[PDB]
Amino acid sequence: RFLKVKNWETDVVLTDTLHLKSTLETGCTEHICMGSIMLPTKDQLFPLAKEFLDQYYSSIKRFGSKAHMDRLEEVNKEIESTSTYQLKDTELIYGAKHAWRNASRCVGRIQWSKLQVFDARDCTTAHGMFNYICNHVKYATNKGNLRSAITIFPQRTDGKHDFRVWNSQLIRYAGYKQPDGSTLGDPANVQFTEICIQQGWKAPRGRFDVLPLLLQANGNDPELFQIPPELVLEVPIRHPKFDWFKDLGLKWYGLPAVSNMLLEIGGLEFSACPFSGWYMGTEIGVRDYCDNSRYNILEEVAKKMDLDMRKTSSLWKDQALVEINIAVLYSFQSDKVTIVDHHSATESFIKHMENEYRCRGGCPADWVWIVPPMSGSITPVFHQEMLNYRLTPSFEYQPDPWNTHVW
Amino acid sequence: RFLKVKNWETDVVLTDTLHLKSTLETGCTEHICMGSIMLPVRTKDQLFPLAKEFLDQYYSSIKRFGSKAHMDRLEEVNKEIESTSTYQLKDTELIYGAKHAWRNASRCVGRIQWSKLQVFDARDCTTAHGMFNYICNHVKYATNKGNLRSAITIFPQRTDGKHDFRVWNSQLIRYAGYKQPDGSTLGDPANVQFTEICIQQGWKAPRGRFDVLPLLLQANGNDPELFQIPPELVLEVPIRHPKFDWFKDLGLKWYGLPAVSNMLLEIGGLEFSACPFSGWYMGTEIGVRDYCDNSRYNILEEVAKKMDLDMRKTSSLWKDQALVEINIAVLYSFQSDKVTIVDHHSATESFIKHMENEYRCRGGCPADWVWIVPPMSGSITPVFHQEMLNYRLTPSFEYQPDPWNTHVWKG
Numbered sequence: 001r002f003l004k005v006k007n008w009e010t011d012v013v014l015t016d017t018l019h020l021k022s023t024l025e026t027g028c029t030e031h032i033c034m035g036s037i038m039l040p041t042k043d044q045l046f047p048l049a050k051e052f053l054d055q056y057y058s059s060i061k062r063f064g065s066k067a068h069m070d071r072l073e074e075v076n077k078e079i080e081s082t083s084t085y086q087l088k089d090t091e092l093i094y095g096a097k098h099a100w101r102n103a104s105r106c107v108g109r110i111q112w113s114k115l116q117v118f119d120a121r122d123c124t125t126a127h128g129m130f131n132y133i134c135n136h137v138k139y140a141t142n143k144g145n146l147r148s149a150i151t152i153f154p155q156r157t158d159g160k161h162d163f164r165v166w167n168s169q170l171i172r173y174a175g176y177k178q179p180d181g182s183t184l185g186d187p188a189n190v191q192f193t194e195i196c197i198q199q200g201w202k203a204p205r206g207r208f209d210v211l212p213l214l215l216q217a218n219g220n221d222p223e224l225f226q227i228p229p230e231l232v233l234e235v236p237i238r239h240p241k242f243d244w245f246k247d248l249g250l251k252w253y254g255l256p257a258v259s260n261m262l263l264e265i266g267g268l269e270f271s272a273c274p275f276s277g278w279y280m281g282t283e284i285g286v287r288d289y290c291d292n293s294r295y296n297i298l299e300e301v302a303k304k305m306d307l308d309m310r311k312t313s314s315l316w317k318d319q320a321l322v323e324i325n326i327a328v329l330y331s332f333q334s335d336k337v338t339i340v341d342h343h344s345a346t347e348s349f350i351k352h353m354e355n356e357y358r359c360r361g362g363c364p365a366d367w368v369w370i371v372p373p374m375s376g377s378i379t380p381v382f383h384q385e386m387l388n389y390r391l392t393p394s395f396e397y398q399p400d401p402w403n404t405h406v407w
Numbered sequence: 408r409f410l411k412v413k414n415w416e417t418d419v420v421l422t423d424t425l426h427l428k429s430t431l432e433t434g435c436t437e438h439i440c441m442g443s444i445m446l447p448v449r450t451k452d453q454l455f456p457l458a459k460e461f462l463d464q465y466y467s468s469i470k471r472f473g474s475k476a477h478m479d480r481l482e483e484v485n486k487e488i489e490s491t492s493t494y495q496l497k498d499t500e501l502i503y504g505a506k507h508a509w510r511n512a513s514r515c516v517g518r519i520q521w522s523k524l525q526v527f528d529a530r531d532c533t534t535a536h537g538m539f540n541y542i543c544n545h546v547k548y549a550t551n552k553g554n555l556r557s558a559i560t561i562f563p564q565r566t567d568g569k570h571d572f573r574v575w576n577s578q579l580i581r582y583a584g585y586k587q588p589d590g591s592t593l594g595d596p597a598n599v600q601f602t603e604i605c606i607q608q609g610w611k612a613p614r615g616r617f618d619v620l621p622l623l624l625q626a627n628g629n630d631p632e633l634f635q636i637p638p639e640l641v642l643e644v645p646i647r648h649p650k651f652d653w654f655k656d657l658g659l660k661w662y663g664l665p666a667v668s669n670m671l672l673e674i675g676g677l678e679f680s681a682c683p684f685s686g687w688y689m690g691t692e693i694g695v696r697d698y699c700d701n702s703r704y705n706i707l708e709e710v711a712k713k714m715d716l717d718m719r720k721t722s723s724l725w726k727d728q729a730l731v732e733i734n735i736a737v738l739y740s741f742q743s744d745k746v747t748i749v750d751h752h753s754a755t756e757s758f759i760k761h762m763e764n765e766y767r768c769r770g771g772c773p774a775d776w777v778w779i780v781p782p783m784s785g786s787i788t789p790v791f792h793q794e795m796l797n798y799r800l801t802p803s804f805e806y807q808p809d810p811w812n813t814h815v816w817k818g
């Protein structure tokens with residue numbers, strides 16, 4: 001019931017008790033581990049509200065005070081009456097910070113308490129959403145000195161009036177299927193790119209076209225908006241040794257901003273809660289650039305390096321992979337756009353785990369996601385045992401809006 | 408209940424029904440996943456069902472389920488258990504058993520090979536000198552002058568827990584490590600404690616960086632005895648780089664034959680506590696883990712110095728660069744000397760094909776992603792993108808505690 005995790009490189013053992021708080025289910029059982037699977041009413045609401053308010057009041061050292069007992073009654077009265085309730089600003093901010101704190105798949109959590117929360121619960125239209133989003137993008141970008149932020153739209157009510165951002169990230173590049181059977185730009189975004197086109201967006205039909213926002217307010221049909229180019233910080237990708245690297249025509253955007261997740265706080269559901277931080281270099285260099293189903297540039301890069309591509313055992317893929325990732329980091333750094341390398345990020349995460357174990361009694365962590373997609377064992381997280389479990393407040397997946405929406 | 412796994416690169420979806428046959432426990436529950444935790448005397452009572460289940464699987468494999476030969480064997484095993492408290496496997500059942508323990512090893516990327524395994528029956532062995540003899544023969548057979556052949560040698564099973572056969576070595580061939588008075592380590596730091604035991608037992612240590620350790624062998628619950636493997640049987644590969652001529656001067660080498668000697672093999676409820684098995688190396692085992700773990704030989708800094716990379720910031724990726732060069736060197740050195748090795752691209756691609764084959768013919772393939780994904784360049788191998796289901800089947804290889812922790816010393 002008290003659980004130990006060991007770091008096999010340093011012999012540091014931590015004791016986890018925080019998992020006993022856990023409420024939601026993992027997908028695993030005593031007979032089967034599902035650790036590598038990507039996706040494994042009034043009566044329901046009051047327990048959820050109570051559990052949340054309890055941890056809130058405990059966090060401000062006011063557990064069992066009249067202020068606590070008063071607020072519990074007030075929300076209870078509100079649920080009895082309205083079948084929902086509203087969070088105080090303080091509770092909203094605490095909830096958002098903790099949803100990040102609880103994100104077991106996130107290596108960047110040493111930062112969790114520095115999150116700027118933008119309360120957009122007063123928003124009513126897609127134009128208003130567009131406005132809040134531009135303000136977030138400009139704030140978070142901060143001319144390259146990136147700052148973590150979340151913008152929180154109105155919570156789910158009856159579920160026929162959902163606020164949604166249809167985009168998967170606020171800033172992403174378009175994807176087009178071509179006569180060749182090949183794909184121009186980002187293949188991950190082909191379907192969304194089709195929705196935008198068929199919604200009215202005239203597409204430049206290039207390799208790096210910033211997608212338009214498709215914003216749904218109050219369950220209405222979503223609407224297109226171009227983010228002002230001056231608010232989209234992009235980085236041309238060059239190499240500090242290889243002159244020809246720039247000739248590849250590669251670029252990426254500075255601001256990673258997830259817009260398709262659902263924030264749950266005290267039972268309340270925020271279906272539009274775009275959040276942003278900054279990149280770890282591997283996300284772009286390894287996954288975005290080198291996944292076979294993404295920009296898949298390994299072949300073209302190895303060619304320019306004149307590597308022996310005859311045999312897998314020359315490790316030509318591995319050599320090209322390193323160079324690409326050197327280039328991503330060198331470029332962002334040269335242009336003063338915040339980025340973290342995988343060595344620095346994983347080192348920070350170990351330190352964060354240690355903080356959380358002593359301060360909180362644990363830290364839910366999903367090893368499969370935390371270990372970087374290159375050079376796994378030369379980062380400290382590889383050698384760190386992790387316990388994965390689900391705490392609330394949380395960010396959760398939710399299905400893509402087009403499958404759900406009633407036009 | 409059918410369970411689906413998806414490859415996210417290819418969209419290939421597979422359906423698992425084999426997990427239904429799993430009895431043993433994973434470590435996980437509905438509230439916690441322990442997928443990254445390294446380690447998450449039987450009576451007549453528990454023994455007959457374990458035997459029955461195994462023999463049913465065996466007779467099914469040979470298309471003789473429910474036959475007279477099947478039923479007679481069940482009867483014969485039952486009578487033998489009730490009168491002797493244990494039973495002996497037929498040669499055929501032992502072979503089938505050892506192969507299946509490999510087939511079922513969820514952490515093994517090399518399983519496409521599972522059915523090609525040479526099984527040496529050493530159950531007539533009685534002494535440590537006899538064990539040495541068996542192990543020498545296994546090493547010479549497996550090595551095959553560089554053309555490695557997978558093999559397992561199986562010593563007598565556990566009886567009362569007081570007469571165990573054990574190989575004290577964690578691998579048959581491995582380098583000594585020596586903790587120095589100044590706190591530095593000479594040789595392989597992973598093997599310091601075992602090295603210390605060998606010395607105390609009487610081994611004369613050459614005290615170098617790549618000293619092959621002596622075998623420490625326990626027969627029949629007796630105190631273990633030391634033996635030196637004849638050097639002519641220990642194939643080694645000096646490590647050099649195809650382009651970097653200074654690489655040879657790092658003084659590196661490795662042995663060709665990886666041979667795990669400290670696991671326990673369970674077949675039909677029987678426990679074989681000494682069952683050394685060997686295959687061949689995937690290159691990253693040596694180039695990434697043995698050479699570059701901070702806790703092992705730790706050669707990254709010295710390699711990067713000689714490559715004259717920018718070492719002042721991690722964001723130059725000097726470590727990642729040096730890592731790839733070392734791994735090229737390992738593969739080049741093995742291939743040039745014609746010692747079998749497989750690179751992680753080739754080995755992971757083969758595993759995916761094995762896995763798909765297993766889902767189709769067997770209804771599943773238990774796999775532990777944490778272990779199957781290579782320790783470098785993870786997402787440029789197809790296994791990174793493959794969902795896997797991890798569950799425990801028997802026959803199985805299992806961990807057991809190091810023997811110095813449990814052994815009753817006779818003196």
Ligand code: HEM
Nearest residue numbers: 100103105106107108111148149275276277278279280395
């Ligand atoms: C400050 C800089 C940050 C860095 C460098 C960082 C790093 C990462 C990385 C590399 C992943 C894996 C992404 C993938 O492979 O798809 C991730 C996952 C995640 N991050 Fe962070 N992160 C940071 C800030 C944040 C912030 C501000 C939030 C929310 C407020 C957050 C919430 C999450 C969530 C919810 C996931 C998992 C998404 C999923 O399950 O698919 N991150 N993060």
Ligand code: HEM
Nearest residue numbers: 509512514515516517520557558684685686687688689804
């Ligand atoms: C034929 C060539 C083979 C290759 C390239 C191969 C590859 C591997 C690798 C890379 C690992 C992970 C090792 C580690 O990180 O510690 C492993 C684990 C394992 N392999 Fe294979 N293997 C092969 C043959 C075999 C054979 C012949 C057996 C037994 C008959 C076997 C049984 C296992 C077991 C039981 C584990 C897990 C060890 C543990 O849990 O600590 N392997 N293998």
Ligand SMILES: N=C(Nc1cccc(O[C@H]2CN[C@H](COc3ccc(/N=C(/N)c4cccs4)cc3)C2)c1)c1cccs1
Nearest residue numbers: 038039187188189256257258275276277278279280283415
């Ligand atoms: N649907 C697909 N597969 C699939 C399945 C499950 C999850 C998934 O992506 C999630 C994982 N994760 C992504 C969102 O989470 C992220 C993304 C980036 C990220 N990176 C950062 N540095 C930050 C973003 C925001 C703050 S930090 C941090 C979190 C989005 C894709 C396919 C696509 C194309 C063909 S099939």
Ligand SMILES: N=C(Nc1cccc(O[C@H]2CN[C@H](COc3ccc(/N=C(/N)c4cccs4)cc3)C2)c1)c1cccs1
Nearest residue numbers: 008445446517597665666667684685686687688689692702
């Ligand atoms: N005691 C430690 N931690 C630890 C905890 C659990 C397991 C473990 O190592 C096992 C896992 N794994 C190893 C045995 O399994 C193997 C090993 C090598 C191997 N390689 C091959 N290609 C083959 C060998 C035989 C047939 S193929 C295949 C399987 C031995 C180490 C530490 C060591 C150093 C600092 S802390």
Ligand SMILES: C[C@H](O)[C@H](O)[C@H]1CNc2nc(N)[nH]c(=O)c2N1
Nearest residue numbers: 036037038368369791792793794
């Ligand atoms: C099947 C497997 O779970 C899947 O490929 C995962 C593995 N680990 C990951 N880790 C991160 N950070 N991001 C990912 O998208 C994935 N993909």
Ligand SMILES: C[C@H](O)[C@H](O)[C@H]1CNc2nc(N)[nH]c(=O)c2N1
Nearest residue numbers: 382383384385443444445777778
């Ligand atoms: C903590 C973690 O589970 C541990 O470091 C594992 C990760 N994956 C591994 N995978 C392999 N093949 N071998 C290992 O030793 C490890 N170590």
Ligand SMILES: [Zn+2]
Nearest residue numbers: 028033435440
């Ligand atoms: Zn699990």
